[PDB]
Every structure is written in C-alpha cells, then in structure tokens.
Amino acid sequence: SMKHIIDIDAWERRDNYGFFRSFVNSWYSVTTEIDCTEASAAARAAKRSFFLYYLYAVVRSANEVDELRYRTDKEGRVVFHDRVDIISPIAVPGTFYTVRIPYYEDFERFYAEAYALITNMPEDGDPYGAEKILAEQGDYDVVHLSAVPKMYFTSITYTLAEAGNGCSYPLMTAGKAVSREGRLVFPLSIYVNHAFVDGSHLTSFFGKVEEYLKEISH
Amino acid sequence: MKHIIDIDAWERRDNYGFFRSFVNSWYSVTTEIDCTEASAAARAAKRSFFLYYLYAVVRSANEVDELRYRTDKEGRVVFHDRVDIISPIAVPGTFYTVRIPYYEDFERFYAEAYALITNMPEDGDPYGAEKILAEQGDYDVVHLSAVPKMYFTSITYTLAEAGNGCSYPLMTAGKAVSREGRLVFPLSIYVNHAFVDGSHLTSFFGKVEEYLKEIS
C-alpha cells in the first residue's frame, strides 16, 4: 500500500531489472541464522508469543529495506510500496489458515493486533481467502512467512511458479530454535527476486531482524 | 501394493490441483541428524555406517504415508504401501545405482543390502536403475546419494520437466562432523509440495534419528 509506479528511466536498478527479465527464474533464496537468546527468554518471561516477536522483527525489517518492497504487479509494472504487511499460515486444529497481519512500528500496537488476528480467526473464513484476495488485487504488497518451529533446517528451497515469473512476493521460512555454544539461534530463510534484491540488501535485512529481536526483549 | 488414489475422497485434492500449475512444485530441506551412537556402534560391529543410515532413511519413508505418493507416468496419483531405496554405489576409477529392498527387520535388511552392494555387475550403466524405473513408470522407490567425505549445509536438486520437477523423493547424506561433543551428519531431501508438507518432513527426520539410535 502507498504505492508508487516506478519511473524506470530514473531507477538505479533499471539495468538489473532488464537483465533478469530474460531468466526462467531470477528468484533465489538465502538461509541464515538469527540469534534469539534474549528474545526467547524475554517472550517466555512475558508469557507472550515468540512467533510474534520474530514476526515483528521480520516485518519491521522489510519495512526498513526499500528493495524488499519492490514488486512486479499483475500487469507487469514495477511498483514500490511505502508499506507492506505480512501474511502467515497459522496452524489450525486438525490444516492452516492464512492471516494478513499489519505492520506497526510500535511493538505494543503490532503485538495486540496480531495476537487478536491469530487467536480470533473467523470460523466461516476461507483459510486461503487472504491469498486469493491478494492475487485478484494484483499488488502483492506483503511478505509471506511460514513458521515451522519444530523443524531445524540449514536450507530450504521454494517453488518456481511460471517461467519468467518465479514468484509474486518475498517468501520466508522460520525454523526451530536450537542451542549452540551458549546461544539460542533459529534458521531464517528468504526468497527474493535478483531483479530487486542483492546480497547487500539481504545483509541489511538480516541485521535488522536480529537487532529488533534484541530491542523488543529489553 | 500400488493404489490408484480416489482423488475426490483425498484430503490433499486441493493441494495437488494447486501445485500442478507450477513449473516446479518440488522443494528440498537440509537438516542435521545426530548419529553419535550409530557411528560408534557401526565401528564396534565392523559394519557399514552407510547401511545403518540407509536403513533409518528407508524405514522412515515407509512410516510417513505422504512420502509414498507418486505421480505415475500416466499422470495418475498413486500410493505405494512399500517403497524400496536406490543408491549410487561408488566404483573406483564412476558409480553404479543399486535397488535395495526395505525390510523392517534390520538384520535381513543389512544382509540383503550388503550382498547387493558387494556383488555389483562390472559392466554397469551408472543410471541403469533409473532407466528401468522410468520405463515402468510407478516410481515405487526413494533415492539416496551418499557423500561421506563432503560436509554441507545445503544442496539443491535438478528440475526434470516443467510441471513435473522430479519423479520420486531424492536425498543426500553428507559427512559426519563434531558438534559440542556429539556427532551429526547433514541430511537433505527433495519432495513434491503437492504431496509433502513441513510436518511430514519433521516426522520423517525424527524417525531417521530415532531409528539410527534404535539399531545401535
């Protein structure tokens, strides 16, 4: 939301976008590790959801790295969003139900709204309604995160949707928190378009994720 | 035996239909498996550690239903009550892929598998087993590649055809390394999202580690 159709002639990545259009898949993923020692302890002490702690860190970080908010819309236009929200499949008794959760820089506002959304899903709600709304609208002004807190991994890969259009928005996976040499760490993976996002931008994003996880634990 | 699935009654009908439209609906996960006890036990027994974790892997695939769904060569969803395991066995100076039958009885599995990997035909196509499987078109196997001298934290897999990224689960096992007094090895698996979610892989990995411990 708060979208800008990019002036590609003035855009610093015009050459990158043109180069990567010719590829069957220009998307790629990186799995890293995030230190969560302090946040794991703090979320437990506060009787709060650790999932929402790192979900806040992830969506805030995406809203502080410009390159993570570029999309190719359903008409092929390069668009930049001043704001992106986060969608996540929430485990449901028996399946998953995907919720769209708004970003607020104020952690207390974010946490309450998100907890209400993941606790109070409508009983008559389509578990895949959020994705269908996003696809029909065609802006893709979100990032998507799947939580797998029981699976430790050092790598995960993602699907290839269409040749020339490998994905529609950044995808992420967060895995099990594990101990190593006195720290608690969890694996975090992200899938992005090379046309929009380089390693330097991912470095900034991962740094902010770890930084804000620490910040909300004090 | 083999079962042609009644897709109208199948709980994954919507998942299967959704992932048919993808160029590649297959994905891989690399994790690590604790093998401290099994490595020590295999050495004490003068036995093949490779066959220890090969057993653990194929048993686990035979205890997670979702790992035995295939799309056959006619496009049908089929479910196998049991799948065997194929593996490229190194031949000094290439490799030869052997099909090894699964038995829950570990001593039977170990004996039959050791016999198969010791008596391989010398004038063998490194991919002949794959060609036999392709002609039959049922894909009642899983595939594991052993690289005991290569430590890795990630490996990716090939994309065969658009709309059909692979024909059966593929796996890779790497070097056992020390981690805070324990021994772990990396294990990677490639599966179809149409058939296998993260919960199923979690069950699979847990069973691999469990059965490695049990046979020790």
Added chain:
Amino acid sequence: MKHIIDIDAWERRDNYGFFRSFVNSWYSVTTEIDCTEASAAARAAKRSFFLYYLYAVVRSANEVDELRYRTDKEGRVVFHDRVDIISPIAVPGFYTVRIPYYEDFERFYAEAYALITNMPEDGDPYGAEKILAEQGDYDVVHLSAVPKMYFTSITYTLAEAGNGCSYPLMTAGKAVSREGRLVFPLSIYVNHAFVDGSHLTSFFGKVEEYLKEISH
C-alpha cells in the same frame, strides 16, 4: 587452450546424455571452509582477505578438470586448460572484473589489486557478461563476495530451460567461529552433467589447503 571433447571417447558420456533432457541439470552445494590461519595472515599483512580466498578458489578450479568443462555457444562440450575468475566489485554509489589465475600468490595479489583499482568509472555492470556471451566460450568461474552476510544456504538463477547456467557460480559469506575455529560458508553452482560430489569434494579440499598454504 580450448579443447572440443570427443564425446564418444569421453568417460562422462553417460552423464551428459542422462542430463541433456533436463530443464535444469545444475545444482548447488554450500559447505564450510576453515579460514583461521588465512584470516589472521591477511589481517597481519593489512591485506585483502577477499583476494586470499579468491586465489584459493581460482587455483582449485584450475586443478579440478571437471570444473573447466563448458557447453559453448554452439552446443559443443569444451574443456579449458585454464579459467579466469570474474567477480562483481562494489563501486562507490558494481563492476564485474575478470582476474586471471597466477600460481605465484604475490603476483596474483598484485595483479588482482591492480585490476580492481583500474575499473572503468563508466563501466557496464554487465559488460563482462556481454563480452563472455558474444565470445561464447565461458572460460571463467564467477564468485560473489558477501563478507558481512552469514548463510548456510544460497540458491541460484535458472537462465533457460535446458541451459540453466553458462559457467560455475560461487558465493562466499561471513567468517564465523565454530568449535574453536574460524570458518566461512562457500557455495558453488555446477552442472551435474560435468561435476559430481567427488569433484566438489576435491575442490573444497583444495580451497582449504591453499588458504592455509598462502598464510604460510
């Protein structure tokens, strides 16, 4: 020197054949490389650690034959006696440089530093790729340096169905402490038609070896 391979006499005939039908026969591996001594030595010399492991990587590629097989622009399998290394160098407010391998580390370091210092200000970020594409031999390997990003996995692009990439791609990440040592993640993307796990094992071993050697 470039050599057009006689596929009928080639020991990997069965492999190039098994993999031509694939949409993508390329795959990547991420491993860990011990860099304790070389990182210390580069710091003591007030020198670029980047060029230390760039030397180790390009030397190792020039000592593993399988990493120098390419499909040229005309579809021919070709083998290069030597390959250079191309790398995107970050530029104030990037430029891909081609750096030749020289066995003398001091010579390599001086030439690479000079090559990176005399980069054109008006240089096309993809000029190296365009020269390479027009020539069509692909006698290079490509390495991307991300020294501030720790990773355990990275994946790579798929260029064309049936031609997933034109030369090996690599990524080197942030050095971290593990079990008392300093290690950094190193990833490589290669064609299964040309490169198996054993070749990657030899390559990774040589990378670690030459990092130690040039630290003296």
